[PDB]
Amino acid sequence: SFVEMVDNLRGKSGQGYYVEMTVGSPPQTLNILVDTGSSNFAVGAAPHPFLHRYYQRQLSSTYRDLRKGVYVPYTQGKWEGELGTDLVSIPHGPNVTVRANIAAITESDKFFINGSNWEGILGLAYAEIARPDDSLEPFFDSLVKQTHVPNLFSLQLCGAGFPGGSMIIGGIDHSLYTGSLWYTPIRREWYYEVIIVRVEINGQDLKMDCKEYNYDKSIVDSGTTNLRLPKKVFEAAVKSIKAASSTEKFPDGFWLGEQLVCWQAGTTPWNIFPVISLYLMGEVTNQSFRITILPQQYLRPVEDVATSQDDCYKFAISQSSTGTVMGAVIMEGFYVVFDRARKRIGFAVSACHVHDEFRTAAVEGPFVTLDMEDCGYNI
Numbered sequence: 373s374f375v376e377m378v379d380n381l382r383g384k385s386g387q388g389y390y391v392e393m394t395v396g397s398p399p400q401t402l403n404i405l406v407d408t409g410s411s412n413f414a415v416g417a418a419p420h421p422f423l424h425r426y427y428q429r430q431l432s433s434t435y436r437d438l439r440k441g442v443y444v445p446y447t448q449g450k451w452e453g454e455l456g457t458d459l460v461s462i463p464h465g466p467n468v469t470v471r472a473n474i475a476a477i478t479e480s481d482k483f484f485i486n487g488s489n490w491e492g493i494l495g496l497a498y499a500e501i502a503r504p505d506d507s508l509e510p511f512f513d514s515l516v517k518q519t520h521v522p523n524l525f526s527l528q529l530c531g532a533g534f535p536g537g538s539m540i541i542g543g544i545d546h547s548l549y550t551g552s553l554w555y556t557p558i559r560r561e562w563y564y565e566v567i568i569v570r571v572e573i574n575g576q577d578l579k580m581d582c583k584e585y586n587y588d589k590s591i592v593d594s595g596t597t598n599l600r601l602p603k604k605v606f607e608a609a610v611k612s613i614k615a616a617s618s619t620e621k622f623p624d625g626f627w628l629g630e631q632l633v634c635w636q637a638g639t640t641p642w643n644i645f646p647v648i649s650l651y652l653m654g655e656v657t658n659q660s661f662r663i664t665i666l667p668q669q670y671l672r673p674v675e676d677v678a679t680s681q682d683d684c685y686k687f688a689i690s691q692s693s694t695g696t697v698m699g700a701v702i703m704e705g706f707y708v709v710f711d712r713a714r715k716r717i718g719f720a721v722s723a724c725h726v727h728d729e730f731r732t733a734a735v736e737g738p739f740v741t742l743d744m745e746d747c748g749y750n751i
């Protein structure tokens with residue numbers, strides 16, 4: 373039941389949200405990163421300094437070796453692994469066990485993070501971006517094929533500042549959101565690709581050709597921390613935010629997201645930072661809705677006992693060369709419905725949405741645009 377699935381996520385700020393899963397027979401329990409930006413189920417399967425535990429295939433009598441290898445290099449990190457299948461379950465998810473592909477990670481470089489408390493990644497996106505190729509069926513596909521679970525899941529990611537989170541598989545849980553749920557089309561089933569049609573910073577339109585917002589794609593990715601923007605859009609956003617907060621002086625490389633800024637506890641000047649509104653393509657022609665992002669989201673609190681006399685933050689907006697990424701800081705405070713069955717993504721204000729006495733995160737619509745341009749970058 374959905375009530376059983378509530379609060380089945382944990383996380384440390386800036387380290388990722390993970391769910392408990394089991395693999396093998398008898399079941400071996402692991403914490404697994406929930407990642408809508410990739411499509412492999414990959415788990416550490418050998419000793420590593422940053423792993424508290426790992427998948428031991430020899431102890432599973434249901435493991436099947438596919439006798440095939442896979443190498444997955446990422447921007448900074450990388451891992452090598454062997455492909456196989458085994459029985460998989462989510463103890464606080466749907467009441468089922470399925471057989472699924474598993475990439476058993478035997479070597480890795482800068483992939484596992486010290487202190488993250490997760491031991492693998494659950495890629496929830498589509499087969500088209502699975503490694504080594506689209507023939508390796510992703511977990512969620514296996515789940516839907518082998519069970520009667522509806523082809524839909526939802527994420528409620530909660531920041532540390534507001535009430536962790538929930539992954540609900542198979543349906544929508546209404547106690548997890550207030551107001552209307554607004555849907556934007558999934559443009560293409562590989563990443564969860566969507567279309568941004570307009571960007572405002574404190575109510576001021578950036579006035580760019582809307583294709584620029586979706587160079588070279590725009591995705592929803594729980595496995596990315598920041599809001600990531602194409603160079604042109606990033607520059608316009610930083611300029612606008614800088615202008616609004618000009619009464620205060622920021623450390624040199626703060627806008628590069630390298631450097632912390634701190635204020636005396638409780639004194640963070642939230643009101644001098646603008647809200648960001650992202651207008652997403654609606655289900656009806658030239659209609660859209662907007663999600664509004666507060667500084668409480670895009671100024672990310674960095675938890676470190678050593679700096680804990682103050683409140684310190686990193687700038688959680690960064691420049692991208694591979695398109696817009698609406699990462700965790702964006703998803704936080706919203707209930708996000710990945711409605712694969714109807715090829716759409718829903719947004720609503722979640723129970724743990726961010727706000728202060730003056731402003732609040734919001735999902736609002738419909739808005740109508742006169743211009744009939746297709747905002748997609750690639751047909």
Ligand SMILES: Cc1cc(C#N)cnc1C(=O)Nc1ccc(F)c([C@]2(C)CO[C@@](C)(C(F)(F)F)C(N)=N2)c1
Pocket residue numbers: 386387388389407408409410446449483485493593594595596597700701
């Ligand atoms: C610190 C952290 C904080 C939060 C928050 N809040 C969420 N996730 C992490 C994290 O560790 N993520 C992570 C680690 C290793 C990886 F190999 C990947 C991959 C498979 C590849 O990289 C991307 C980003 C993509 F493909 F887009 F490039 C992706 N989505 N998944 C992700």
